[PDB]
Amino acid sequence: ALLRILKETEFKKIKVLGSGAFGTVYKGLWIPEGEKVKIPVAIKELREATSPKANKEILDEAYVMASVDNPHVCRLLGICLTSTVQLIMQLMPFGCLLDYVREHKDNIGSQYLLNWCVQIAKGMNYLEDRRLVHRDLAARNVLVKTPQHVKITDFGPIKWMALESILHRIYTHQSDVWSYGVTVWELMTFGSKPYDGIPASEISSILEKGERLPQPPICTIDVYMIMRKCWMIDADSRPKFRELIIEFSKMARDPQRYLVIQGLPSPTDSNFYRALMDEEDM
Amino acid sequence: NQALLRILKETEFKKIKVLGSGAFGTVYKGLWIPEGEKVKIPVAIKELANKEILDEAYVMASVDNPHVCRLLGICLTSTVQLIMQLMPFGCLLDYVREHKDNIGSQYLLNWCVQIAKGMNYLEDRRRDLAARNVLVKTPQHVKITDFIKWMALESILHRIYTHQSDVWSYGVTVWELMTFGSKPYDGIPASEISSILEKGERLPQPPICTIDVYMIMRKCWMIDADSRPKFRELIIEFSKMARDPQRYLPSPTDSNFYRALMDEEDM
Ligand SMILES: */C=C\C(=O)Nc1cc(C(=O)Nc2nc3cccc(C)c3n2[C@H]2CCCCN(C(=O)/C=C\*)C2)cs1
């Protein structure tokens, strides 16, 4: 296996970073046995309600999440089986792409937005190839390791779910393509809230009437066409993740043609970033 | 070349704590603050012509080996401040001292293989080496950093430093590891080591070393530099002994856990 079972004595919560999923993300510190070092980690402590065999349920799914090997998706490194289960992984210092794009609503060039879509599409394709449904894809679940390396998190949201998911709980790799389209919309709207004002209980109604999200101001039709095609009522007519990688990489080679913004640090800074924080292959 | 180093501006860094000291500087600690960002990244800071130092600093930023340290940054303001990735375990000298018991045979021999792997790389790229200058990333990954009782005889006599003079320094470093951090020539002070080396039968055999291991140490200390073994030969012989370590002297779940958190560089 690749999952390490931890004890309460070998790690400690020191702060709180946010709530999410069935638990709360707590910045932690890992203390190896017989060592004096403190290693920063991320700790997600679920809710209280479990069951005696729920741990067997969680362990089976935890083993799968500990087996992913892609630079854009991310790996579950450890777990703690207490009254409330605690999950341990590597700490992403920049948080998520949603808040990062919101707080940096200016210094986000065109190249950064298109390359983020390429990397998110690369991670989602890896999940599709491993035949794993995500179901919770969104800008809040795209973590930023370095400003040039994003990673998808929280594997297994009415305004992010496909129509077939809201109507009768149909979750497929094409339903994630819908979630990919909403995630791209949030990035290119600089963190705007989708369907702002329109209550959840009425989203399925407006989708049944042909209302998609508005074209963001910085998106040409070439980018907006891709977003709309991900939101077709026919799931099989939506583009595949392998096709999104190719088209978004095509636009990345000429970013100012496909993104219109008013107003990607040199390898000197990229080598400095990866030597300190991002030593994985890609 | 140019895209391997370019840091400085104290406006981006601060020293915060202490981790021992060194003759050339203090390791301290520190935190790097990227421009326009709110995160604090732990780094190591060595606070000790600028065109001279910068040219040599470029060279230290050009090494690409898992067991050789790259110079990531340097502030040319107060006194040559050096930036690298922070090694939480300190050096291999203190670590072997602090854990001088639960160090199995495989751990000691593989450390010698990795030091020989790093030293060979330095020879491959064409002045020190010691247990104190071997930093520990993880307890499975050691790394050579920073650039009398460790110098070769020709180095002590008249400043002759070659890749074979490092083999002498490699031999003294191996002695320190297998003596669990003992001090070489304990007691003999100031100028005198060169006198005993021209007539001596080398440093004593450590208690845990078989004759096969002590012979390698003896051959590294020959008065003829060209008769000393090559770093490429030390890798092969120490790897041979590592496959049967108890003859000559954790689980992948934990190794993957170490590297996913602290050591994401290739094997
Ligand atoms: C991909 C890794 C994995 O398997 N699981 C997860 C890792 C994280 C994580 O590292 N979150 C994180 N790191 C932070 C550093 C500094 C500040 C903050 C706020 C922060 N966070 C988040 C904690 C909860 C997740 C939501 N957060 C957002 O900002 C919203 C997008 C903050 C999580 S899962």
Author numbering:
A (entry chain B): 702 to 857, 877 to 983, 989 to 1007
B (entry chain A): 700 to 747, 755 to 832, 836 to 856, 878 to 979, 990 to 1007
Task: Reproduce, without paraphrasing, sentences from the article in which this PDB structure was first reported.
For example, mutation of Cys797 of EGFR is a major resistance mechanism to osimertinib, a covalent inhibitor that is currently prescribed as first-line therapy for mutant EGFR-dependent non-small cell lung cancer (NSCLC). Here, we report a general strategy to delay or prevent acquired resistance by developing dual covalent inhibitors that simultaneously react with two distinct cysteine residues.
In addition to clinically validated targeting of Cys797, our analysis showed that EGFR contains another cysteine residue (Cys775) potentially targetable using a molecular bident strategy. Cys775 is located in the back of the ATP pocket behind the gatekeeper residue Thr790 and resides in a restricted, less polar chemical microenvironment. ZNL-0056 is the first compound capable of targeting a nonconserved and partially buried Cys775 (behind the so-called gatekeeper residue) located at the back of the ATP-binding pocket in EGFR. To visualize cross-linking, we determined a crystal structure of ZNL-0056 bound to the EGFRT790M/V948R kinase domain at a resolution of 3.3 Å. The structure was obtained by soaking AMP-PNP crystals with ZNL-0056, and density for the inhibitor was only observed in one copy of the resulting structure. The structure revealed covalent bonds to both Cys797 and Cys775, though the electron density for the C775 adduct was weaker suggesting reduced occupancy. As expected, the benzimidazole amide core forms a hydrogen bond with the backbone of Met793. The thiophene ring tucks beneath the gatekeeper residue Met790 to form hydrophobic interactions as well as a polarization interaction between the sulfur atom of Met790 and the Pi-system in the ligand. Next, we were also able to identify two cross-linked peptides from Cys797 and Cys775, supporting the conclusion that ZNL-0056 forms simultaneous covalent bonds with both these residues intramolecularly. In summary, both mass spectrometry and cocrystal structure confirmed that ZNL-0056 targets both Cys775 and Cys797 in EGFR.
